[PDB]
Amino acid sequence: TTSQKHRDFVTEPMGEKPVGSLAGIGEVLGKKLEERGFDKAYVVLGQFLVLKKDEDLFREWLKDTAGANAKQSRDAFGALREWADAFL
Amino acid sequence: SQKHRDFVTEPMGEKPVGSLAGIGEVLGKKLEERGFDKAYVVLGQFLVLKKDEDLFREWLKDTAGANAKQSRDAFGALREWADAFL
Amino acid sequence: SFSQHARTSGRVAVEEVDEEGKFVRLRNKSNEDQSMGNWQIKRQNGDDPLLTYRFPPKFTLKAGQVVTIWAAGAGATHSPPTDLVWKAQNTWGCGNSLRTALINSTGEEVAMRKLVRS
Ligand SMILES: [Cl-]
Ligand SMILES: [Cl-]
């Protein structure tokens, strides 16, 4: 049940990938993140890192900033946790 | 600096904020008090600011009292690290 | 001349990258053998087109062992499992930024060594 987006994201450096490349980040959620300065996947990684990789703080930040649902927040968190554990 | 070379050459992992170039003892404890205890937390702030030099260096000066040389060295180490590992 | 930046997420590291482009050297830094059949080495030199070496379909890098992947022009012989020759390619390439990455057979970057000119 890891999405094709999750698999393509966690397997290599994110570089300049758009925020939509991150698992859980659909077209509506991505546009809302872009609108608030979270335009690239690395900016959301940055927020995840400022929150010390905390699941509850990251997931509630994603819901409050761009209206993500529980599933979207769980998948975005899971993709960043896995990516950070391999590349950071 | 010796710190800059040791930092930019490998993944930062769980390194303390003091491992970052420019982050001396005073600057490091003031970052640790504000929740920036590991180098990855400061990388996070650098990334939230879209790697912008002026915003990152101003943030380091305003949050933990860094001087111009300390801000320049921390920005330079984070920029070089991100260009290799991100 | 070049600053080195390396990362290893699994058993095998990109231990050394020849600055003159003759070879890439990997080492299994673990206590277990690593199957690397169909694995790849992606080499990005500046903005030049990506070069990709593909390991034989059956290849094991034993625990603690080195394997050097030579360019065809370096005057090296294909003597496995220690030395492989990249038949198609006479150099690993030059430039100001040389990124050598080890990829498993399914596209996962498991290690890298990057050389950036000073
Ligand atoms: Cl998804
Ligand atoms: Cl300056």
Numbering used by the authors:
A (entry chain A): 2 to 89
B (entry chain C): 4 to 89
C (entry chain F): 429 to 546
Question: What does the article say, verbatim?
Answer:
BAF is a small (89 amino acid) protein that localizes to the nucleus, at the NE and in the cytoplasm. BAF dimerization allows for its binding to LEM domain proteins and the Ig-fold domain of lamin A/C, while each individual subunit can bind dsDNA. More recently, BAF was found to play a direct role in repairing ruptures of the NE by recruiting LEM domain proteins and membranes to the sites of rupture. Nestor–Guillermo progeria syndrome (NGPS) is caused by a homozygous alanine-to-threonine mutation at position 12 (A12T) in barrier-to-autointegration factor (BAF).
